[PDB]
Structures are given as C-alpha cells and as structure tokens.
From a paper:
α-l-rhamnosidases (E.C. 3.2.1.40) are found widely distributed in nature and have been reported in animals, plants, yeast, fungi and bacteria, where they are responsible for the cleavage of α-l-rhamnose from a wide range of compounds. α-l-rhamnose is found in plants and bacteria as components of polysaccharides, such as pectins, and the O antigen polysaccharides, responsible for determining the antigenicity of pathogenic bacteria; it is also found in rhamnolipids and it is attached to small molecule natural products, such as rutin. The family [name] α-l-rhamnosidases catalyse the hydrolysis of α-l-rhamnosyl-linkages through an acid-base catalysed single displacement (inverting) mechanism.
The final model consisted of two KoRha subunits related by a non-crystallographic twofold axis (giving a corresponding solvent content of 73%) in the asymmetric unit, with each monomer containing a bound rhamnose. One domain is largely responsible for forming the dimer interface, whilst the other is the catalytic domain and the site of rhamnose binding. The rhamnose was modeled in a distorted chair conformation. It is bound at the bottom of a deep pocket, in a narrow inner chamber [Fig. 1(B) and Supporting Information Figs. S2 and S3], where the pyranose ring is sandwiched between Trp 341 and Trp 226 (which are structurally conserved in the other three determined structures) and flanked by other hydrophobic residues, including Trp 335, Phe 338, and Trp 510. The rhamnose makes eight direct hydrogen bonds with KoRha: the O-1 atom with Tyr 498, O-2 with the putative catalytic Glu 486, and Trp 341 (both conserved in the other three structures) and also with Tyr 498, which is only conserved in BT1001. It is notable that this residue is preceded by an unusual non-proline cis-peptide bond, which helps to project the carboxyl group into the active center. The single displacement inverting mechanism proposed for [name] α-l-rhamnosidases invokes the participation of a nucleophilic water molecule that, in KoRha, would most likely be activated by Glu 486. However, our structure reveals no evidence for a water molecule in the vicinity of the β-anomeric position and within hydrogen bonding distance of Glu 486. The reducing end of the rhamnose faces a more spacious chamber at the mouth of the pocket, which presumably represents a relatively non-specific aglycone binding site.
Residue numbers in the entry:
A (entry chain A), B (entry chain B): 11 to 523
The structure:
C-alpha cells in the first residue's frame, strides 16, 4: 500500500499543535457494587464512606475498594500510600482497574471475547518496593470509577492510602458560551454534550479518549460543527484538515484516520464516505472560520476525493455495491450500503460545487451536470413507489440509512422528501440505526424538511434516554431496543465518551431549540 | 516495641555505602520447557534458536518465548521493540516473568500457597502505547530465565524485539584471587560459591538478591568469612556492623535484620543466636581488618548482647527452653533448640573473652569462670553417655544441630568430640539438617576435630550435588533427601542464590583443600 507525504502541509499542522491544560481533581466517594438486573448494564453503586474515612483504613491482602470520581475524566492518576504495623518486609502488590461505567470494574476483563484488541481495556499492576510511596502513573486513562485491589502484602504489615487524585487534560480550556434554551431537558442534554466534546479535544479531535484515541474523518466532521458554537478552536480544525491532506495514498485518496505518535502516519484504511467528507469539512471550515488561504491551498485535495469517488459509478450513474468494508455509514453488519453511499456522493458533490465556484469556476459547470445525472439515476434505480422508500443492493433492502442520506442529498422534490420522513415515523424500516452518529443525520433530515417539532422530540427521546440512564458523556454505540449491543463483541470495549454523539449541542445552539 | 537510634554509628555506616558497578550482558539462547520427572524440579530446557533469529520473529497475540540468559544475574532489564505489518492501531500488552530456575517460569504463580508474601514472585505487565519503544524497567530482578508473552496486540500488526540485555549490578567489582586447589571438583564448587557471594554483595550483604534483599546477622557472619579470602571489602563488613549497632531495641539488643530503605530501620524481630553473633562478627573483623578503633567503639554493643543472653540461663547455668521462635539455628520446624542454643552461647562467650582481654581485662576474669560453669552444666544436664550424644529439651530429643554446636563450643575433651563426629556417621540423629547454613557448621566441626579428609568428602557430596544438578549459585534451602522442601510452603519462593551457602570458598581457600 503505497503512500505519499507532503512536507509543506505537515509543517503547517505541526505549528498548530495545541497546548494541553492540566488540572487536578479529587474523587467524591468510596462505593460498593451490587448486581442489579434493572440498572445501568447490571450494576448499581451504593456510597459507603467519604475519602477522609478511607484514608484511615489499613488494608491487607485481598482487600479492595471502588473509588467514584463523580464525573468522566481523561488524565493521569496520582496517589500517596504508606505502611502500617511492623516495618514493611516485602513489596506491596496492587492491581488497578479503570472504567467509564461501573460495569467495567465489576465484570472481569478475562471474559472479553471481541475482535478489537483486549489491550484497550484499562488496567495496571504495581509492585512498590519502598514505602512510603508517591506514584504518578505514566499512561493516560479515561474513567469515572477506579478499583484498587491489594493483591499481596505480608501478614506483618498493612497498606494505607493518604491521597488520591486525577490530573485531567484537554485542549478545550478556553471560554464556552452558555446555552440560551429555556427547555430544562435540552439544557441537561447540552451539558452532557459539551463535556463529551471537551474530553475528546486533545492534541487532535480524538474519537474516544479511552479508545481509539485517534483522529477519524467522519468523527471530525461532526466534532467541528459542535466546536463552532462552543469552544471555537478553528486552529484545531485547520490542523486536522492539514493532517489528512499531508499524508495520503499515492493516488491521492485521504485515509479514514491518522496517527500522530510517534510521528504523523496515516492509516492504511480507506473509506468511500470518510474520503468524501474531507470536502464537507473544508466547506464548513470556510463558512465558520472565513479562511480563504487554507481553503484555496487544500481545494486540490478535496477535488481529488471527488475524482476518485466518481469512478465507482457504473455507466448508468449508480454507485457499485460490494461485500467488503468499502464505506462506513453505521455500525450495522447487516446494512447494505449502496443507496446511502449514493446519497453521500451527491451530498458531497454539492459542496464540491460550492467550493469550485470560488476556486475553479470552469469545473463547477460539469460538476452541476454530474449532480443531475446522479440524482436522476438514484430515482430511476433506487426509488420504490409502492413502499415509499429507496431500496439498496441486489436484494432491494429497505434501511433507515438509505432514506436519511438520499433525503440529505436532496434527491426528488421537497414534498417527496417530507413524505419520506413521515413514512419513517409511521412505517419504520427493518434495518435500524445503531449509533448517535447516524441519528445525527436523521435529525438533520427532519430539520431540512421543516419538521422542527419532530426533531426536538427526537433529540429528547434518544439522547434524553442516555441522560436518564445516568450518562456523564454520550456513548459511541446506542440502540434503545438493545442497550447491551456492541459491534465489537463486548460492551466493555465500547467507548462511553464519543464526540460524534455530541451534536445536540450544535442543533440546540445553532437552531435555537 | 521501643527502639533506640544512635546517630553517630549511623553516620559512620552511611559514609561507607559502596558504589555499585553496572555492566551489560546479552542472553545466550531461546529455549523451550518440557515437563520431565527426572530433571531440576520437573522441567528441562531445549535450545531452539539463537537471539539473532529471535530478533527476526514477528509475534502475535498468544505467542511467547523463554530467554535463557546463561548465568545468574541481578539487575535491570533493557529491551527495544518495534511494529511489523500495518501501522500499529492499539497498545501492545506484554507479560514478563523472571526465574532463578526454569521451574519458576513454567509453574503458574497463581498456584502459590505460602506464608511469605506472593509479591516476592517476579513478574511485570506492560502496555506500550507507542512503537518503536525503548524500555528500561525500574525494578531490580534476580534471574536466569525470562519468559516473554505477547498477551494482546490487534490482528493488523505484529511485535518484533530487536535487542534484549540485562544490566547487572554488584559492589564486588574489584579483583578476586584464583583458588589454588588442584582438585577439579572443588574448583567447580568454589566458582559457584564466588558468584553466589558476588550477587549478594550490593549496598549491604543481602541474604538473597531475589528475596529477601536484606541484611541479616547470621548470614552476615558467614558472608564476612568468604569476603575475607575473595573480594576483601572490609569497609562493607564495617558498614554492616555499624548498622546493627546503630539502631537497637531500647534495652540494647540488636535486631536479627536491618532495612536500609527508605532509611535505616531495624526490624522488630529478635533472635538469641543472631544477637550473640554480633560478637563473633566483630571478633572476625578485628582479626582480618586489624581495625582497633572500630572494635573499641563497638565493644559495648557486643558486651551487651552477652549480658542479655546470660539472663536466659537458670541457676545451674543451662539455657531455658520454650516453643516460640526465640533462636534460629536452622529451618527445621521439628527441632528442639535448647542444646544448640547452649552451644552458641558458649561459642560466643569465648569470643567475648578474647575481645574483653583487649578492651576490658577485668571482665574477662569473670567471663572465664562463667564459661566453665556453662560447659559443666552442658555436660551434666545434656550429655547422654549411653547414646553418645547430647539431648535437648524435656523430651530429650537427639538432633544433628545439638551435636554440631556443642562440639564447636569445645565442651568436654578433644577425643570425646572426635568420637561424637564419628557417631554422627554410625547412628545418624533423627532430626536432620535442612540448609547449607547448618551444614557449614558441620564442616567446621569436622575440621576442628582434625577430620580433614571427611570434611573434603562432605563438601563434595553436599555442595557437589547442587553443582551436578546444574546450579549457577548455591541455594538457601537444601535437604538432599527432599529436594522439593520449603519452610515457606513453595519451592518457587525459596532463594536460589543465598550467600550463607557459599562458605566452601572459605574452607577451600583458608584450609588449602
Ligand atoms: C469506523 C470508525 O472506527 C470505529 O471504531 C469508531 O467508532 C470510529 O468512531 C469510527 O469512525
Ligand atoms: C531466618 C532468616 O530469614 C530467612 O527468611 C532467610 O533464610 C535468612 O537468610 C535467615 O537468616
């Protein structure tokens, strides 16, 4: 897999690396876990003591506690501990376990049976040869709960903690305007959304601070919108644009995600939709930041994503389907992706035209003709009048995703599109949405068709459910009908702070809901 | 338990802290373990590749190897490793296990049952967030074999080690005269002995570098003898004398062992014999180093150990017996210790007299009378003519230890004592010796009675057995009839480099065997 580096673009990205603010926080309580069928993933917390009382305890082999930090934090653990009893005559062996949910410190990691690496699960053994001890752990953890287990000391002495804190980090340490909304339930959702984005904003826009700690293009697109009306760090959107542009496949296609440690390496994973989203991110960045220099410099990268995407169309102007993981759309293994991909192409071509009008007017003429072909081809090949929905693939599957994306693409007439959104509400497709990522687009489609009250009710029903369940930050994965669901094969390795799920802040602020 | 600090003595000890020499060593092979009934603790090594070939390997989840370092080392692990395949998209989770014997990296630590802390078992989990990686582990390990297990990486990449070394440490980095002996089997034993002492000589004379990494008085006594004819670091014997003298029980009794991290703390463990051995260590130090200043300064400490010990005698001059752990002698739970303790008292009183002659002549007069009382009382109460052995305790137990110590004490006549050592041949006592520590004294008793050929044969039979089994260093525990034996409950937590077992070097060199 041949790649191409662009030193000029990478030097621009490097110069825009943000400083991180570091800030200490103590935890709020010691708790005990109780298995409970009717709770957040089967486990309930009960407060048992303050921390001042825990600092008086003298722990022996086998003793363990769970520390509730009170909110969701990303950062570095610091603690002090010391001996009690006789002079300490052996190392103290501890085991630490970190969780975003309570369930992550109650279910054993040894039972994880998924296709992501188990190494993402947060855990650390320590051997203290000398007491008293001052410990600053080097790895960055993302957690609310911390389990501390004394695996082994000798019978001659006991261990005693005197201080525990987390040093939390973020690049979103600037001001953040308060939301106007007079609706208390939307306010609560906005608060959770903003915290979600804050913890994801680091040296790049990370998708999730526990996992994958990495810049992805689909995620970036949504995060940039929220950033726009919260922390307004346009320099960081610019940095992330130059990163994707600075290291590409040799034919010019941008990667789905980028690493920045130990140096900038772009992944060998390529997605039809994420590539095209480079165009929409560049367009939204121009609108919000008003930086013509950057948009002009990066336009060729955007244009190239379109040149390459258009080669996937057959003679009749419909995107070819295949069984490999060629486009993302949602975490839904049974989803045929052809129709949704057609919609993404048409959506992003439209933005390529708006950009072309400024930087390459002559090309906009032919792009406009091409837009028309694709929309017509979508109607001819994909629309099914009897069902009132678009079908996808050789077996003519009906999904939510197909409808959402072809409505956003503005295929057909405004009243046809409004009729489709009513059809979802009264006659729901079989293949459902699994992520707040895809739900974001459902909301956008509702608003675009002037269904404003329906969009408000939908934000409240879906994201309000996560809030009512007790979420501090919004989740990577959420299907209300199956709250245990994981595409990875364990809810333990899902992310519970994922910024592609924090767009309600944008909807609420931008549309004045 | 009230203690007393002596700042003057501790400042002298601190000023004599030795510099450590650090020196790099590569391992010699990759091996595979095979369960084998007739081998060193049930496990046999087979070489499978060089290290140059292992540095070409690309390891995935579940792969593991065993690295043979070729000898016994004490020090710090350094290695480099890097990614292969796709760009690394998750942390690399490794598990390291360290063993002095092969069995320690083959038997699972999770099965350890014992009264010593399991935290002594050497083990370390690592999560590498970034590759390539340069790793220098901070803890000091004592090992020959190293197991390296890749617990988890993702399917997209593999791990590849490019260098592995141990940085070995010791304070015995000076010259060391070669042994004269023309006997090839004694030469082999001397080589193993010298390496044993070398690894135990650190910032103090440690009893064992894996465990307990600590200065004990009984161990010190034997280590100082060997030091005398090998590395000749008298400054270190002096340091260790001032440590025991510098922090005592409030009534003046020295502790059995001393900690030196984070500061000097003497243990709350007190042993009749180890306390008295302060006298013999001071005496041997004067003979070898010729340092009258130190011996004069520390004489009051020595004298006080005798004052206190003599209070354990009844009116008739026999030491009172009890079932608590009041005296050490050997790791033998079934041993009645009264007779051996009587012998240790008489042995150490004799040295207190030789010291008193120089620093307090008037006291030697009464000590000489007391020596006579104790020897007489030993004959009257403990000698059994019908059996030709000394008995110990109310149940008149016959042990090896009783005979050994009362012969070293020079109770009775030279011929009586020679007849006792012959009797150990013809009617071996029921309660056997479990350590090379006690065996050292058996050898000394043989030599003292002029049984020189028998002492040579006994060094060869016992220590030669450990060599023939494949030992790089001599062991803390060794009963030939039960090689699996542990007073701690698992052979995993025994020490396999214990300097109280390296005295053959002294015997061989000092007596020109
Ligand atoms: C497809 C890509 O990878 C998944 O693991 C994460 O959910 C990420 O947010 C998504 O954009
Ligand atoms: C009794 C004392 O402690 C044991 O654990 C060690 O074997 C040490 O060497 C010994 O001197």
């Amino acid at each position: 897999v041949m790649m191409t580096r662009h030193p000029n673009f990478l030097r621009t990205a490097e110069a825009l690396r943000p400083a991180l603010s570091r800030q200490a926080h103590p935890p709020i309580a010691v708790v005990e876990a109780h298995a409970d069928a009717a709770a957040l993933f089967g486990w309930r917390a009960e407060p048992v003591s303050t921390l001042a009382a825990f600092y008086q305890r003298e722990l022996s082999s086998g003793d363990s506690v769970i520390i509730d930090f009170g909110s969701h934090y990303v950062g570095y653990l610091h603690f002090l501990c010391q001996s009690a009893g006789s002079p300490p005559d052996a190392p103290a062996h501890l085991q630490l376990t970190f969780g975003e949910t309570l369930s992550e410190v109650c279910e054993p990691f040894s039972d994880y049976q998924g296709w992501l690496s188990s190494s993402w699960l947060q855990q650390q053994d320590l051997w203290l040869d000398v007491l008293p001890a001052e410990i600053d752990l080097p790895r960055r953890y993302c957690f609310r709960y911390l389990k501390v287990e004394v695996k082994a000391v000798s019978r001659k002495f006991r261990l005693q903690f005197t201080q525990i804190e987390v040093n939390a980090v973020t690049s979103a340490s600037g001001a953040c305007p308060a939301a106007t909304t007079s609706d208390p339930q939307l306010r609560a959702i906005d608060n959770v959304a903003v915290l979600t984005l804050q913890n994801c904003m680091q040296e790049v826009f990370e998708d999730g601070p526990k996992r994958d700690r990495r810049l992805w293009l689909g995620d970036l697109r949504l995060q940039a919108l929220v950033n726009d009306v919260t922390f307004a760090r346009h320099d960081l959107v610019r940095r992330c644009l130059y990163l994707f542009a600075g290291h590409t496949r040799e034919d010019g296609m941008v990667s789905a995600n980028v690493f920045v440690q130990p140096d900038v390496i772009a992944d060998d994973t390529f997605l039809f939709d994420y590539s095209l989203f480079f165009v929409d991110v560049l367009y939204n960045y121009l609108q919000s930041a008003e930086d013509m220099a950057t948009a002009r410099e990066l336009w060729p990268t955007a244009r190239r994503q379109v040149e390459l995407a258009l080669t996937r169309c057959d003679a009749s102007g419909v995107v070819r389907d295949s069984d490999d993981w060629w486009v993302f759309i949602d975490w839904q293994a049974s989803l045929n992706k052809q129709a949704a991909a057609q919609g993404v192409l048409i959506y992003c071509l439209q933005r390529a035209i708006w950009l072309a009008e400024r930087f390459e007017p002559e090309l906009a003429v032919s792009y406009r003709q091409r837009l028309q072909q694709l929309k017509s081809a979508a109607l001819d090949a994909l629309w099914d009048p009897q069902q009132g929905f678009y079908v996808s693939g050789a077996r003519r599957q009906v999904s939510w995703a197909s409808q959402i994306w072809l409505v956003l693409a503005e295929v057909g007439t405004p009243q046809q599109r409004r009729e489709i959104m009513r059809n979802l509400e009264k006659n729901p497709p079989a293949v459902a949405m699994n992520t707040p990522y895809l739900r974001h687009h459902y909301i956008a489609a509702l608003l675009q068709c002037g269904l404003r009250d329906e969009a408000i009710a939908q934000i409240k029903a879906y994201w309000g459910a996560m809030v009512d369940y007790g979420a501090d930050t919004f989740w990577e994965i959420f299907d209300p009908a199956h709250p245990d669901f994981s595409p990875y094969g364990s809810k333990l390795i899902n992310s519970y702070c994922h910024a592609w799920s924090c767009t309600p802040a944008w909807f609420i602020r931008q549309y004045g809901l």
